[PDB]
Write a protein that binds this ligand. Sequence first.
Ligand code: SF4
Ligand code: SF4
Ligand code: SF4
Lengths: 198, 57
Amino acid sequence: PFQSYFSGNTVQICPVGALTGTAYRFRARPFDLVSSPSVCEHCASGCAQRTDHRRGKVLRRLAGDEPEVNEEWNCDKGRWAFTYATVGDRITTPMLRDGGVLRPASWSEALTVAAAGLLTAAGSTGVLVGGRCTVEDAYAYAKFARMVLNTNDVDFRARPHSAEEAEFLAAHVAGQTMGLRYAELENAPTVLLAGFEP
Amino acid sequence: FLDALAGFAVTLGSMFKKPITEGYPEKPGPVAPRYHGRHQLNRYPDGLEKCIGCELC
Ligand code: SF4
Ligand code: SF4
Ligand code: SF4
C-alpha cells in the first residue's frame, strides 16, 4: 500500500478526481459543505485546517494555508481523525453515580452534587487536566483549582513525566513564546533531536 | 346615451352564455403540457434508477 502518514495530502494536491479520500466518497458536493477554519487537536504542530461538515457531521479536514506553521500540508491523523466524537461513546448529558450505576442527570442536579462533593473535599483535591484542553480550558482548570479548590495540585501531564520535567518547563518553556519557529527549523544548520521522533 | 348602460347588456348577455368554469375537482381542467408539477425520479426501461446522486439538482 501507499503507507505514509501524509497520504491525505496527495488527495488534496490532486487537481482532478483521480486521487480521492475513501472516507469522503460521495458524501457531499462543495455547495452543501459548511466550511470553517480550524486547528488540529492532535499534535503540538497546530496546523491550520479547514473543517468541512454536512448536516452537522464532519466529512473532511483539508490542510488550509498557514505558511508559518504547516504551509499546505497535514498528516493523516489531522485530516481523518475527526470521527472520535461520533462513535457512540460520547457523553450526551451530565451523569451521576446513583446506586453504583452511572445514571443520566440534569445539569442542575449534577452541578449541585459536584459542588457539594468538592466542598466536602476542601483542600484534599487533585485536578488532572490532561493534554487535550485548549489554552483557555487549561487556564480555567488552573483557576478553578487554585481559586475554587485552593489547591496547587494541578497537572496536565497524563503521560510519563517527572518533576525535573516540571522544573524544565517552568525555567525554559513557560512564558517564552516564539523563541523558535518553523521558519527557523528550515534554516537551522544543525538540528539535534533528543527524545523526539518528529 | 345608451352607451352608459353598456355594462348591463354585458352581464345579462353572459347570464345566457354557458359558464366557463373548469369542473375541478370532479372534472379537472387541462394544465399546460409544460407545467411545473411535482418532481419525479425516473427509471431506465430495465428498472434501474436514473438518478446518479450527482446533487446537481
Ligand atoms: S470528472 Fe471529476 S476530475 Fe474530471 S473534469 Fe469532471 S469534476 Fe474534474
Ligand atoms: S495535522 Fe498532523 S502534524 Fe498537524 S497538528 Fe494534526 S496530527 Fe499534528
Ligand atoms: S441532478 Fe443528479 S442527483 Fe439530482 S436527480 Fe438528477 S441525477 Fe439525481
